[PDB]
Symmetry: D2
Subunit: 301 residues, 4 copies
């Protein structure tokens, strides 16, 4: 035919998060063609140069730098960004989707911009798209930060820690302690459990503390953001803690929010209802409610 | 025993080049333990946090943030940096080596700081170390940029292009056209050869052009810098175009300079003398001479 | 120095299991140097040829084909093999260890030969070695077969299934249902639980059924056998269900047996006592007792 | 939609070569879905079991075990096999293609069965398919065996050796010495060149010698066979020495034969005419002629 390309990824916003994500992909042999778009076209040119000179050294991807690329483009990751935030980004966002949509996009969205659950909701309303194809970054990094600290604690690997952070990827989020294991051993390894509400405070004050000695978080997210990518593209059917549309599940009804979902090559398969505890349902409820608010408050632009 | 670690890497300088290198390693499953040092300790703390939260998502490395780490530390990559440059960095450098040396280091150095061939020479004089264990970054990125453009041209993969950039990683460097193939087909695919002195001008004005729309090159080098790393650590016995000490080979005698060398787990094995052409010997000679100059000019501090 | 090699692996027995293991390693970029030994030296020559011609295509290992290789050899995997079995192999085995031991080995053993828990015990008695450095293959494949069927069932990935098979890697083994999750959701997704005692019967009759249409299992084990390898060599601190020496834990006292252990670059770190249920303690007890028997029964040779 | 799968591979013949190829893929994270077909359905069941139990340990592929799978099946690798050979396999083959063709296949063929150039020609005649979509295994392993021995010799890595074996993957093949480098240094490192006609005799008597201490070659080919796979599926635009249809190039006209071709996601891009030497054109000519013979001799069935 021509020169094909069955695994394409467009990043809108080639800033710290966008670029480090890209370098993630590439260094990891994940996508096939990677387009890169930025209002700051000159920054895209530079990034894309840079990426193309190291290429040879990695294992084989393509890197290009409008939206006309989003049309047989398997997925679009929006890394672009500014309640006078929620209104700024909604604003920003309102042109991004439209623009990509207006190219006859048929794929998936990966939103990672703050405030994610919200910008994720907005991306859907603006997309038209079914809510199984519009994915938030959500509490993914949170769960990693958590899994890390714990694993760190216990001396095993974060990879044997099984604990989720659910709720608003922000202040309102909560650790599901009731269901948190190391392999199959509950945290019955310590009692009070359900030193550790310590672990979770760091897990939660992490952004602030990283920003404060370095100006920003960007490596972390991209790792997380490259995981979902991997899940989507490879039909993994994996259970990542994303930013999913609540169905009526957890008994919430028109909020996007940080939840275990099953990812694979067609968006989300299904949300999971971990059997949340007493105080969790209340935490979750509060959290979902903090969002469902900003949702009706804001919007407009 | 304790908790071991047979593959350690210390980066002095956790700036753009340092950090992107690190993220390179990690995303690529290359070292085992990665220490990170920076005069700006706060930037190291932040980077190291950031790296540690995404970890779980990659395949298994350790990340820590003095020099006391350089003592069973397999290799030290100096990413730190400012003729009132050559004197600044020599200056900077003069404390780095000493400091790491004073820890009872026994390993290899990877210099990537400009002006590399020079800072590479200086690192040796300051190291004490045999010149087979002090490696410059040298014309590695150049050769990649070259291999890329060509491969790009010919429509094959940079990975089938065989062409070297030798000489000063800078202005004075030269493309070895006389010996430049695509697989085994010389560039006898086009004539004039030994559109293409075009390819090489871009290869050579690349830094300027990338810096100018983005402020700096950092992804490229790290790819290159992660290749050598791979070579060293894995005993590859590979022929990379490094920043090697000229022996009397190419008939030059006390200059570090961009040359094909054979890398593997013990430093450099041996330099290669590609059979350079007439005009090349003259280019090479000029180039080596531009350095051997700055070498006796500068120094002091 | 010479030409080093910090990651070496000797396989005694280059049969189906040995060779497929090797091809596993290599295709997976895991060890650095791989020696291969077999009473049938001619089969080693052939395998090692074969492996060396494809090499170039994989990412960089070395393959050689006595025991004098076991002396700075990081680990030795015994893939060699024939109660007139237990006496045959003990017999076989009794020369293997001795021979490798007599080379001044200082490393770890990976036994995968049936009957593993037993040949694993024997390898220890014969090694001299601390029981944290003599590792059985144990119920690793079992747990995989299990994780697979379940994951298969539930439609997620085996990688989100958390369920262990503990006890004798054989007839007497038991599934720890009481502690078996999908992420963090117990199997409270179905009731009777603690269609599924179906899943576990296949998990347990798998060898017989694979052997019967193909003569043998060899891919499976090597995957499993390459996982532990990965764990050992990379200091993973991972929780694999190995063939560990019971301490007095599970309240058993001089039996090697299939248990969660924490693996990393120095043997086993520590065994875990999952909080086994009523009927499990009884199953476990019976199982451990089936072994502790064959142990005093057999031996001699 | 359903559960997709954009990277599928059907192997007809799940023998030594077929299975080791599969294990290659899987252990290497290359295809996405891998179907496996064999006249000996019971051997497919067993292999596919075996593969599925280790899965979890590798990074994510699917394995299933008629031809109805070849219909959105990206590629079909024929590993199946018996002049009363050429007539047996042609015979065998004549049903394979037909059968897969009769499923509405639209993809590529990878023939690896001996006598390959011939069975590759036959697969085309029987396919209907354009000759850019019917690929022979050809002199790939030969070139590897060659690259290996040399690299072995010179002490560098086979990966820096650039030398091709062209012609019949068999007796009649020839080493293109005239164009054979190490990086960019011709073999002007030794003279007589165009100890070494030694290297090439081993390169050529390798099968016989491996078969004779082990019954067969199967790891080697699968490495090679997994390289092309990688090339096809990832649009590499790489220059592998395949089994291509000669155009009139090398001035030959209706023979499939071992040649440098450029591989990528749509079959072959283009054949290359290395500038073959005097004695080579004569060797090549003889070789091509040995085939063009068996071609008109045989056929029928
Ligand atoms: N979900 C998480 O865990 C998480 C983690 C980290 C950062 N983030 C978010 O990433 C977003 C941006 O991250 P960053 O730190 O890399 O930002 P940044 O300051 O580097 O800016 C990113 C880029 O956005 C591009 N951009 C902005 N508006 C654009 C538009 N209208 N069209 C095209 N390109 C446009 C800019 O030109 C810039 O290059 C923020 O909302 C931030 O919070 C989210
Ligand atoms: N060889 C090549 O191809 C090449 C390519 C790109 C950049 N580089 C070189 O990398 C060097 C630095 O690169 P960059 O763009 O990332 O720089 P940068 O501006 O980001 O600074 C790097 C870091 O050096 C640390 N540092 C400086 N002095 C220090 C000291 N005395 N001890 C410890 N840490 C110290 C700083 O705190 C800073 O974080 C430059 O010389 C640059 O030219 C070389
Ligand atoms: N733990 C598990 O899950 C598991 C799984 C599969 C198979 N295995 C075991 O692997 C063992 C062998 O497996 P296989 O199917 O590949 O066997 P195999 O029939 O192919 O024989 C393996 C090899 O052992 C070599 N060998 C035998 N005695 C030797 C000695 N004294 N010194 C050196 N080499 C010697 C032979 O020459 C042969 O090449 C068996 O006990 C089998 O049950 C264990
Ligand atoms: N090109 C090369 O470098 C190269 C290298 C090695 C081997 N090979 C070739 O591989 C071919 C087979 O290799 P092997 O050693 O693995 O063979 P093998 O003896 O193991 O047989 C392979 C399989 O073919 C299956 N098969 C045979 N006829 C079939 C049919 N009509 N339909 C479906 N399945 C069928 C059999 O049931 C068997 O499982 C041979 O021609 C051999 O020379 C080629
Ligand atoms: O062109 P060939 O002989 O097929 O070899 C390709 C190999 O050569 C390389 O391009 C190395 O090239 P150089 O010889 O320039 O170092 C590898 O990256 C690649 O795997
Ligand atoms: O289910 P989670 O918490 O998302 O974690 C998945 C991780 O757990 C594992 O399945 C390990 O599981 P186990 O706890 O049974 O050892 C890894 O293979 C995988 O990466």
């Amino acid at each position: 035919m021509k020169n094909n390309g069955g695994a394409r990824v467009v990043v809108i916003g080639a800033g710290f998060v966008g670029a480090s994500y890209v370098f993630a992909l590439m260094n990891q042999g994940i996508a096939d063609e990677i387009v890169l778009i930025d209002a700051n076209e000159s920054k895209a040119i530079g990034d894309a140069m840079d990426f193309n000179h190291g290429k040879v050294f990695a294992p084989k991807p393509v890197d290009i730098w409008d939206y006309d690329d989003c049309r047989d483009a398997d997925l679009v990751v929006i890394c672009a960004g500014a309640l006078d935030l929620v209104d700024k980004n909604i604003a920003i966002f309102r042109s991004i989707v439209e623009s990509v949509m207006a190219s006859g996009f048929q794929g998936l969205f990966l939103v990672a911009t703050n405030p994610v659950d919200i910008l994720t909701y907005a991306t859907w309303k603006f997309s038209g798209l079914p809510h199984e194809r519009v994915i938030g970054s959500g509490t993914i990094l949170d769960t990693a930060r958590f899994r890390f600290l714990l694993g760190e604690y216990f001396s095993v690997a974060p990879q044997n820690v099984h604990a989720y952070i659910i709720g608003e990827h922000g202040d309102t989020e909560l650790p599901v302690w009731s269901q948190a294991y190391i392999g199959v051993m509950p945290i019955r390894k310590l009692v009070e459990s359900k030193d550790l509400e310590r672990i979770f405070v760091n897990v939660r004050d992490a952004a602030y503390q990283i920003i404060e000695k370095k100006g920003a978080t960007y490596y972390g997210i991209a790792m997380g953001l490259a995981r979902v990518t991997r899940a989507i593209l490879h039909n993994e059917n994996a259970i990542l803690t994303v930013s999913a549309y609540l169905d009526g599940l957890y008994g919430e009804r028109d909020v996007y929010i940080g939840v275990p979902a099953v990812i694979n090559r067609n968006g989300i398969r299904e949300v999971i209802e971990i059997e949340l505890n007493d105080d969790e349902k209340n935490r979750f409820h509060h959290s979902a409610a903090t969002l469902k608010s900003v949702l009706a408050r804001a919007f407009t632009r």
